[PDB]
């Protein structure tokens, strides 16, 4: 990893991140067959089997009753698109003809591919353990509607198999049919690994995905299709990672403030977030929740990206002279703050605040001068601002300083723009 400190703009650029970009969705329909539980009745009063059975009928009945700020512009659009796309696909799946075809498709196997009337191909998987048990056991065990049988093993068995079903219904009921994530009950580890293996991607992408099975779950979601007879039908949208290992970097910045004649000329780069090159194009991810790190890998959702011109990288090289409209924000008010980076931290220390760096072994080592200072995780273990202590990162990597005259020193002494927002570097000067 390489972190470069930019004295010119009081910002840092960290390179060497790899890209794991979600390019599509793989629709998987699951049919959890509950069986003919409706005809089971308990006439011998309260019993252990009756308690789970009544809960099961209750769960089934309950389910029948359910069926130009870049970051502010883009945040949730990918999420809304993901849900909307799933809902669009769900409406296609809701057709009785498709449910009938899928049920017929799964009549002879536990996994089959069916083409919906809307033309989308979906992978269908059958879950049969519960229907088998109940029919071949519980149903029979329940003789002449008597449920208080002495065979406690039967009751324990039933409570064990229904655990998954009750959890699935609970998650959808508590989430009003749209869950935020794929729990182990919606798709087990074995089911996920099998589903991934059938994805239309290269062997290399599949391998990367198989190693990070846990990350795949967090970006997916489940949607309840409905209740058709004795089978509960739901759909799971799995993320398709069609682009992997592409150069990504993250830009972080802190307020660059210069003080002339007691006055303050501050400047803050708002072009912060993740940027990745893809097929020579630069994709910008402005929302916090759309990119997540795992070591050198940053998982970003392509549906959250906004394509930016390649020239946007010039803002990290010569923002002062470049013709590219590097958008920043300014304000005659100084803000002292710590911006933690992967390989260090930006420490903006101005008038009125006491700033020092320290280590767990030596405590306070030295006071920091006023202005924007970059501290490597080798020079100190912790940074302290007044009484606020910030713990430094222990990631290993290379640190470089790109010297340059601060842009804030190139403000207009005659007149400084006041509290600028959603503007550009030229507007500040």
């Amino acid at each position: 990893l390489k972190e470069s400190y930019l004295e010119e703009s009081c910002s840092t650029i960290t390179e060497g991140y790899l890209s794991v970009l979600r390019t599509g969705w793989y629709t998987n329909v699951f049919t959890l067959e509950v069986g003919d539980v409706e005809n089971l009745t308990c006439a011998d009063g309260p019993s252990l089997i009756k308690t789970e059975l009544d809960l099961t009928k209750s769960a089934l009945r309950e389910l029948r009753t359910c069926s130009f700020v870049l970051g502010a512009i883009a945040c949730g659009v990918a999420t809304a698109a993901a849900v909307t796309a799933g809902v669009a696909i769900a409406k296609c799946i809701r057709l009785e003809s498709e449910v009938t075809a899928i049920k017929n498709c799964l009549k002879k196997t536990n996994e089959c591919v069916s083409t919906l009337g809307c033309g989308v191909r979906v992978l269908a998987t059958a879950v049969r353990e519960l229907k088998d048990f109940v029919s071949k056991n519980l149903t029979r065990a329940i003789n002449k509607n008597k449920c208080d049988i002495p065979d406690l093993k039967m009751a324990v068995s039933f409570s064990q198999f229904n655990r998954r079903f009750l959890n699935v219904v609970r998650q959808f009921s508590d989430n009003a049919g749209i869950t935020p994530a794929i729990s182990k009950d919606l798709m087990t580890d074995a089911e996920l690994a099998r589903a991934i293996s059938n994805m239309p991607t290269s062997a290399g992408q599949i391998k990367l995905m198989l190693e990070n099975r846990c990350m795949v779950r967090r970006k997916g979601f489940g949607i309840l299709i409905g209740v058709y007879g004795s089978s509960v039908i739901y759909m799971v949208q799995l993320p398709i990672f069609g682009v992997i290992d592409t150069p990504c970097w993250i830009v972080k910045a802190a307020p660059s403030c210069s003080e002339k004649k007691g006055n303050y000329a501050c400047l803050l780069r708002e072009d912060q977030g993740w940027y990745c090159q893809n097929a020579g194009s630069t994709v910008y991810y402005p929302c916090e929740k759309d990119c997540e790190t795992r070591g050198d890998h940053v998982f970003c959702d392509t549906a959250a990206g906004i394509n930016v011109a390649e020239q946007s990288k010039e803002c990290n090289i010569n923002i002062s002279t470049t013709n590219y409209p590097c958008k920043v924000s300014c304000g005659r008010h100084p803000i002292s703050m710590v911006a933690l980076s992967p390989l260090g931290a930006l420490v903006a220390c101005y008038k009125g605040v006491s700033c020092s760096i320290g280590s767990n072994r030596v405590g306070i080592i030295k006071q920091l001068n006023k202005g924007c200072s970059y501290i490597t995780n080798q020079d100190a273990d912790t940074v302290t601002i007044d009484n606020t202590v910030y713990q430094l990162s222990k990631v290993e990597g290379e640190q470089h300083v790109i010297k340059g005259r601060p842009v804030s020193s190139s403000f207009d002494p005659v007149k400084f723009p006041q509290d600028q927002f959603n503007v550009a570097l030229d507007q500040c000067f």
Partner: antibody
Amino acid sequence: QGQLVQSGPEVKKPGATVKVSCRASAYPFGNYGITWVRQVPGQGLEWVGWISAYTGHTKFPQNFQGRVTLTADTSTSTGYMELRSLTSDDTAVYYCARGPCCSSPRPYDIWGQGTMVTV
Amino acid sequence: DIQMTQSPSTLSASVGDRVTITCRASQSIDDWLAWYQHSPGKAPKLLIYRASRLESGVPSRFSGSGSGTEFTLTISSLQPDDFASYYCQQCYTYSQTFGQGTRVEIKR
């Protein structure tokens, strides 16, 4: 109902390589897989191999591992089976059948008319 | 792999006779057994799937039963067109091992 049309009988000399065709019809080929089964004269049914027409993944039994190459053209809905290092004892009827799309096993519901391969 | 043993290997019967064919799995395969009809010189025909479900277009005289490791194919009344070799197949493991087959011959 879908239909399968296999190539005609072929007679080849020992050690040659033979390529057998399997044309699918009347069904959505791209949603299934093709399994190959042979019947040696006087012997039972033996699995030869399987290919997913959706993913292209292949699996083979130990006696056919490395010897058989399977291909599935989804554009023409035609499968081909190529058997290498033919021996006189490999003279048998090779059948292509509609196998599972994926790892879940299933019965074979569509069968070709069969191809007599003579070594 | 699961070895599949059919019994008997050959059975001679007359038209209308009740025919019974057994298939044994070396380990439990639940209900994942399939049955195929293979007439000489004709392609194999699927008869039963999931141990007991009758295939579309198969005459109702054919019935399948059993579970776990032992499965049985029963023909309620053998017709002239039923004299053929029958093969059971387990649909539980990836290898889908076939049985050695049972030949149904006309009783002299």
